[PDB]
Amino acid sequence: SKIIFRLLLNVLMSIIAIISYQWYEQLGIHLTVAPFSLLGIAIAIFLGFRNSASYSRFVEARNLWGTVLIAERTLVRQLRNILPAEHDAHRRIVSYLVAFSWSLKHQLRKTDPTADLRRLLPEERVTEILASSMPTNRILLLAGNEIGQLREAAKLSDITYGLMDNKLDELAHVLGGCERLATTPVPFAYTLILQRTVYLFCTLLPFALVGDLHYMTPFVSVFISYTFLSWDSLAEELEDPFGTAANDLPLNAMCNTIERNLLDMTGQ
Amino acid sequence: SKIIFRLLLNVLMSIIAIISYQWYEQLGIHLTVAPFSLLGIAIAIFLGFRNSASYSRFVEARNLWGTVLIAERTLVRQLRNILPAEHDAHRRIVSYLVAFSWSLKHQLRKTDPTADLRRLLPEERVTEILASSMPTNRILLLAGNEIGQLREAAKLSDITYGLMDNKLDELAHVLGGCERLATTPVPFAYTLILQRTVYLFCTLLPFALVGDLHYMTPFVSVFISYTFLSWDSLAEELEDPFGTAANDLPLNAMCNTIERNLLDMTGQHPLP
Amino acid sequence: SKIIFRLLLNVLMSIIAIISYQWYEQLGIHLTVAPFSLLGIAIAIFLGFRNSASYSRFVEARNLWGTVLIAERTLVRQLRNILPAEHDAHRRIVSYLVAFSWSLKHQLRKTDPTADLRRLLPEERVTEILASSMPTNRILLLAGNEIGQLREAAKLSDITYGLMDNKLDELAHVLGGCERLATTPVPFAYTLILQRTVYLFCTLLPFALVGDLHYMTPFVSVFISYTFLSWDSLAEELEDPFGTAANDLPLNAMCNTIERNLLDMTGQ
Amino acid sequence: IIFRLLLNVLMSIIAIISYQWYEQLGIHLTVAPFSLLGIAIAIFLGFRNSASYSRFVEARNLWGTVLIAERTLVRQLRNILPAEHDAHRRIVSYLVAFSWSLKHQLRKTDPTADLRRLLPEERVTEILASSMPTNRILLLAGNEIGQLREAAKLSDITYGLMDNKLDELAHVLGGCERLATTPVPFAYTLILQRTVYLFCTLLPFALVGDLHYMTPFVSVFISYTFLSWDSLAEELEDPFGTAANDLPLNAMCNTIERNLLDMTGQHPLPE
Amino acid sequence: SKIIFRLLLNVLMSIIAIISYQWYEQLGIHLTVAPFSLLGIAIAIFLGFRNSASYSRFVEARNLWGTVLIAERTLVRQLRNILPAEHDAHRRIVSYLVAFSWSLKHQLRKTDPTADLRRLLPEERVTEILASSMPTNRILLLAGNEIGQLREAAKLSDITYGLMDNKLDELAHVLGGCERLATTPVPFAYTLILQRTVYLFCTLLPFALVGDLHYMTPFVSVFISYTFLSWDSLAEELEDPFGTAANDLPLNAMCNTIERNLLDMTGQHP
Ligand SMILES: [Cl-]
Ligand SMILES: [Cl-]
Ligand SMILES: [Cl-]
Ligand SMILES: [Cl-]
Ligand SMILES: [Cl-]
Ligand SMILES: [Cl-]
Ligand SMILES: [Cl-]
Ligand SMILES: [Cl-]
Ligand SMILES: [Cl-]
Ligand SMILES: [Cl-]
Ligand SMILES: [Zn+2]
Ligand SMILES: [Zn+2]
Ligand SMILES: [Zn+2]
Ligand SMILES: [Zn+2]
Ligand SMILES: [Zn+2]
Ligand SMILES: [Zn+2]
Ligand SMILES: [Zn+2]
Ligand SMILES: [Zn+2]
Ligand SMILES: [Zn+2]
Ligand SMILES: [Zn+2]
Ligand SMILES: [Zn+2]
Ligand SMILES: [Zn+2]
Ligand SMILES: [Zn+2]
Ligand SMILES: [Zn+2]
Ligand SMILES: [Zn+2]
Ligand SMILES: [Zn+2]
Fold it and tell me: Other CB atoms closer than 10 Å to residue A85's CB: what's the count?
């Protein structure tokens, strides 16, 4: 909460305004409420639309992760339904699917996958994966080798191969989606503009309130600031969905659910 | 709603400002309207967006439930159309599909699936299902085994297997979509912030209103407070569409519909 | 057009405020514009968001019906192009597709589909359909059966069977969508809340306008009221897409269009 | 539009040279009520313009799909049946006829010349006989693909890959039809237009109090804002209406013709 | 983004309003705030909706480019998984997929693709591609011949050919979406209204503010103009996402990422 300092700096800005209202006539400065209404409203409208975009970006992240669990569940389901004997293949594929999740998590958090990957895969595979500048993509390529092998060994027909291939595509879209969200921020200009504007607004506001509210100036002014600043900071918290804040996605729990899910489906 | 408390708790504070308005003088308190116009409009705008976000959650949730019915209807149709004679599988698969929907409702209402499960499937299966930490998924896996067995037995080809396989994917997307709406709400700041704000605004509003309205003050403040608080609680309601409030989804009716659909006439169908 | 009732009731509410404006401050009752601008604005925002939802639900009802035409057109096309010889199957499948439309209309309007079904299908099939607790869904099953026969008789392969099965899936999505829309209104609370506030607001309004407009009160309180009610009433006129009112979907004409189209494509 | 700005100036001058008589009599117009009205209308115009915009965008997407589907079908024909140039040419004909015919259908203009240039007279009579000419064209494109399958030049699989493209065109056809026979509101766009229209005419009277001579200036600026927003919605609401901008629809049908002649090597001219 | 010119011209207009407020009474002109408030809020609402549309277009554009990378990655994945031995095919298709991306960037920027094409493909292919009303389209058709030839040679079945066909189908959709976003400014009613509107409003605002603020006019007037103009020009940037403004897609970087991914997946080293 940087908000609380911003509130107290605003109570102080109001005192400065009461004490200084005297020399207003002298200095030749009069400030009515009316234009601050115009400005405040304008700012609230833009804050509303901005916040809308931030929430949508957070929702997209959530959906992207939702697909991971859906597509992995159904790939394992398919593997069991189509090749119920082939538990060798099941185990290999499930570990790739589980690696994909953790890999994706680490990629977005800008952290080290080595532990999670080493915990899941053989060494001849882990070094291949960490070798690529696109590890997560590499895990998908390898999961693909698995299904292709079962195809070449005639365990899968072209059709059944096709069914599982679609699920890798789904995972591909998730990877791209997340990378896209990670690297493409909501234009910095939104935070640039609005952060400036909101701060300057809350700051100048008591200077305009004072003529009308006098000593009441602090109370009302801090209230209006709390409304604006709270809404503005909610946008901020929603904007980095892949971060570590408690307000961000619990990527760790999500990857756990995924792992436990795929292990449950295989009996582990 | 649960608004009449705070609507009354507000008629009080509105008399206070009719008794106080001459004493503003003495204490040193001026309070025009225009600042409260500004603050009120801002809150309206934010209430607007919040409510819209809440409704989308409602609508998505309704849609995900819609797909359960569609996807189950079409899977049964496919089984009837492609394997018209295989009533044993028809029956097995339908009860899994019916279990699926009830199981999903229990999952989301945080209630016990056992009664509904036992009503539909044999007990060894009820224990396979309850054994899992994700029972709905387990029912899907079991439904899939039914389809896969018909395939291993060469009653389905790969193509016709895949037609049915698609429908199970559709249901997996419902499960996933539903879990996503349930585990994560709209981040808890949303409700914490807005409720504080709307109410704080509502109580102070008359203190600033009197000077203009004089006597008509407590009315025109309760009217405004109704509007703001109405909107805020409806949002709070729709936000949790698997809840049990009046404006949430009728999940029990929806599973009843699904059930009556699949089991329509002791499960009997015209044969091609 | 009960709107012109409320407009008239409004002219009357002006006139009591015009003449009763005297005894106002003696009582101590004042109504300024400013707080009614706050309410008016807040209500307009909520009216906006709401009518939005109303509009979307109506657009969805059109889209769904639109898909009937699209999917039935394309199923008929596929049958002509894949099985040009097989006019018997053509005519059967077409009568089911036409029955489906009419049946869906009857279900949404809660009317008796019997005559239409009897004009299109043999009595036995009608009996099958009407015996079901879900007749329209049963029409899909029968059409599926016709397609299934073609498959058994090897006139269709699995692949081409599949191309046509996809179309019955689309019709399934239409049927579910309509059912969902029919049983899921825009939540009542919206219409409740808003009808209270809009009604009370347009009532209390010439009161809060008279001490500003005096003799221009009626002509301005009514123009404002017509504006809120016009816009509140656009919701009313969009919330019953399946109805028979002038502003509701012309489902009979759309059903004729569907039938006319399928008959054009089979040269009847 | 510019007629209603000239009327606004006229009403503004009336406002000044009449402000005298009427406020003396008991009949007053303040700014605050017309400010609540105007903001409400602005809000409504906002939501209205949102719905309009999204019908405009839907029309662009549908037409976008024609370009995409037609390109990919022809690509599929070349990649899968490289040698069947006669089929390539017939199919491209129908594809191009489909576009032009859709455009004609939406703009309620005559497709005859486009059909006669593109197809044999037998087919043109057949297509013109139908009450659903565009759908009939898709059906004929269908027969082409169908015959290639009958002759065992397409397998059921590869027939299917091409069939999808025809379905995409089916979706476009119906989507556009639905966008055309609209709107959805009924004669309520006439209500909000008149609401804006009346609001802009009463407004100088409500302003003259505060602005006197400045009235016509500030009044016409405001009127302009509302009337512009309103008429932009009118345009957007009706992408296929009788007074629409036909430049991009014509651009699209030309692009696709051009693209397909390119893909089938009917372009460039030979050396 | 010569926005500061518009702001300074606004500070100027403010002084013009102060110095001329003296003559104000004498000339016979009154200008209250309340009517400018009405217009101002209207315009704000309009900028709100407008800006939101612009953002949407930008997000769509970004998404489409997202799909290039996804679809191309997965095409190469299918090629390796299904035809592990056909490394010639691997290389030729990859150079088409890489040519596709750069060619798309060129198309959208209206620049010449000749250099990049020549870097990636034999000259015969370059000539074929350059000869076409739509080079990206021709590139997809060439990629299509590759998998087509593999199908002809019975190295792909109809089904596995189809799986790969779908990916080219996806690229066609991307191509179309980008064409649509690039040739869809809309009717230039977003300049006759929003740009000049906001502009005029901002310069008349001080004339209207001055009776109330006196010397404070330019401070308040600048703050309000900043707010509106910031909002407006950000819309402008977002509206044209394939442009070269600050806030427009780094298409060259996105193309490099694409190329690098595809090179990574097929054994090769940048
Ligand atoms: Cl899936
Ligand atoms: Cl296993
Ligand atoms: Cl389905
Ligand atoms: Cl279709
Ligand atoms: Cl026939
Ligand atoms: Cl026929
Ligand atoms: Cl396509
Ligand atoms: Cl050719
Ligand atoms: Cl050719
Ligand atoms: Cl893909
Ligand atoms: Zn899926
Ligand atoms: Zn296993
Ligand atoms: Zn082993
Ligand atoms: Zn490391
Ligand atoms: Zn489906
Ligand atoms: Zn049965
Ligand atoms: Zn009093
Ligand atoms: Zn379709
Ligand atoms: Zn026939
Ligand atoms: Zn009705
Ligand atoms: Zn496509
Ligand atoms: Zn050719
Ligand atoms: Zn050309
Ligand atoms: Zn004067
Ligand atoms: Zn894809
Ligand atoms: Zn290779």
Answer: 9
